[PDB]
Amino acid sequence: SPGIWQLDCTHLEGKVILVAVHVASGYIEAEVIPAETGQETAYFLLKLAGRWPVKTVHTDNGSNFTSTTVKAACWWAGIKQEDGIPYNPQSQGVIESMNKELKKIIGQVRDQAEHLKTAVQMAVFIHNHKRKGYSAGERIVDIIATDIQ
Amino acid sequence: SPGIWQLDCTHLEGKVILVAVHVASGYIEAEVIPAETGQETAYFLLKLAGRWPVKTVHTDNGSNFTSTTVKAACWWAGIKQEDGIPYNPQSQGVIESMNKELKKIIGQVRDQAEHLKTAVQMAVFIHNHKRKGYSAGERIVDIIATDIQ
Ligand SMILES: O=C(O)c1ccccc1CN1C(=O)Cc2ccccc21
Ligand SMILES: O=C(O)c1ccccc1CN1C(=O)Cc2ccccc21
Ligand SMILES: [Cl-]
């Protein structure tokens, strides 16, 4: 459970925003890419897994689930690849809500940056530091530290 | 001390590898860029600070120390920008050693990837997971979780 992440893909300004959410904490990492390909998704997971102890990834769609490049990256990084089928139906609406929230934050910072990618990273910052009184950033560290001990 | 990071820039295949090291743990994040500019460095710090609680950054050289774009990014992200002058002389040789080690790991994986950026991320993975018996990845989480409590 401290090792579970969910992939999520959303669109803005004719570009793709790839998101990984740490399910237990709500902590996210994100990147802007021209389009969702197996190679981009594989590279993103490789980055994620070098930064956080990723055990399981729920993929965002069947193309990334099937992608041989994605499967190779998960093998390389010791990640168990799974489907992201909302067996809990709450799950899809939660993602939708996260995408709406992220896009809201992007809109609030959009004018402070020329390039979308910069605005996305600012939104990641704001999302992860937001107090809700712990932040997502604090929760993920606490969850994983507890798990290490 | 749990909030202190050090910037480091090194070169390979005619490209630049930008590294941030969490001083207390030895944990790293890295990226490949065409060349070290204020804008690239600023973006890299924005990414870092949205992912980890960055309080202080020792910059890697005087150009990044002076850069108005870097200073703006540190202001935005609540980061105290400092010089990286090795007042402890131990410090410069430690960086050198890290660069040598990273390049060694890059060489060991280089043939498994077409693009240098992929090899760099694989090396970050290997570096952060290496048992030394805790890993850098485990140490950074422990250090910061302890600090939160
Ligand atoms: O405008 C951009 O997209 C961009 C790209 C790379 C670095 C900085 C920026 C924009 N920017 C500044 O110039 C100052 C600044 C502070 C904080 C965030 C972004 C920026
Ligand atoms: O060759 C590359 O640079 C590159 C770029 C993006 C994604 C995957 C790769 C290479 N690669 C695969 O195709 C399989 C694989 C597993 C693990 C890491 C990289 C790769
Ligand atoms: Cl797409």
Nearest to A29 by CA among A108, A98, A77: A98
User: In B, which residues are within 8 Å of A106 by CB distance?
Assistant: none
Tokens of B99: 């660069």
At residue B38, what is the residue type? Answer: G
Could you tell me whether strands B27-33 and B4-12 are parallel, antiparallel, or unpaired per DSSP bridges? unpaired
The CA distance from A66 to A74, in Å, is 12
The total number of structural domains that make up chain A: 1
What is the number of other CB atoms lying within 10 angstroms of the CB of residue B104? 10
Ligand nearest to the CA of A38: 2
User: In B, which residues are within 8 Å of A124 by CB distance?
Assistant: 47, 50-51
Q: Cα distance from A98 to chain B (closest Cα, Å)?
A: 17
Instruction: Answer for the pair B44, B17: CB distance below 8 angstroms, yes or no.
Output: no
> Choosing among A121, A126, A128, which should be mutated to test the B contact, i.e. which has the most B CBs within 10 A?
A121
| A85 phi, psi to nearest 5 deg | -70, 120
What is the number of other CB atoms lying within 10 angstroms of the CB of residue B139? 18
- Packing angle, helices A38-51 and B116-129, rounded to 10: 30
Q: Cα distance from A94 to chain B (closest Cα, Å)?
A: 21
End-to-end CA separation in angstroms for chain B: 15
CATH number assigned to the domain comprising residue A11 = 3.30.420.10
- Calculate how far, in angstroms, residue A51's C-alpha sits from the geometric centre of ligand 2: 17
Nearest ligand 2 atom, CA B116? 3
Rg (CA), chain B: 15
Is residue A92 within 6 Å of ligand 2 at its C-beta?
no
Range of the domain at A143: 1-149
Helix/strand/coil (H/E/C) assignment for every residue in chain A: CCCEEEEEEEEECCEEEEEEEECCCCEEEEEEECCCCHHHHHHHHHHHHHHCCCCEEECCCHHHHHCHHHHHHHHHHCCEEECCCCCCCHHHHHHHHHHHHHHHHHHHHHHHCCCHHHHHHHHHHHHHHCECCCEHHHHHHHHHHHHHC
CA A125 to mean position of chain CA atoms: 13
Resolution (A): 2.0
A47–B146 CB contact, under 8 Å:
no
Is residue A42 within 6 Å of ligand 2 at its C-beta?
yes
| Interface residue B33 vs chain A (CB under 8 A) | no
Q: Cα distance from A11 to chain B (closest Cα, Å)?
A: 20
Q: Using what technique was this structure determined?
A: X-ray
Helix/strand/coil (H/E/C) assignment for every residue in chain B: CCCEEEEEEEEECCEEEEEEEECCCCEEEEEEECCCCHHHHHHHHHHHHHHCCCCEEECCCHHHHHCHHHHHHHHHHCCEEECCCCCCCHHHHHHHHHHHHHHHHHHHHHHHCCCHHHHHHHHHHHHHHCECCCEHHHHHHHHHHHHHC
Handedness of CA B15, B73, B64, A114 (dihedral sign): positive
> Choosing among B122, B138, B140, which should be mutated to test the A contact, i.e. which has the most A CBs within 10 A?
B122
- Calculate how far, in angstroms, residue A35's C-alpha sits from the geometric centre of ligand 3: 4
| Interface residue A29 vs chain B (CB under 8 A) | yes
Residues 6+ apart with CB under 8 A from A84: A6, A7, A58, A59, A60, A61, A91
A128–B51 CB contact, under 8 Å:
yes
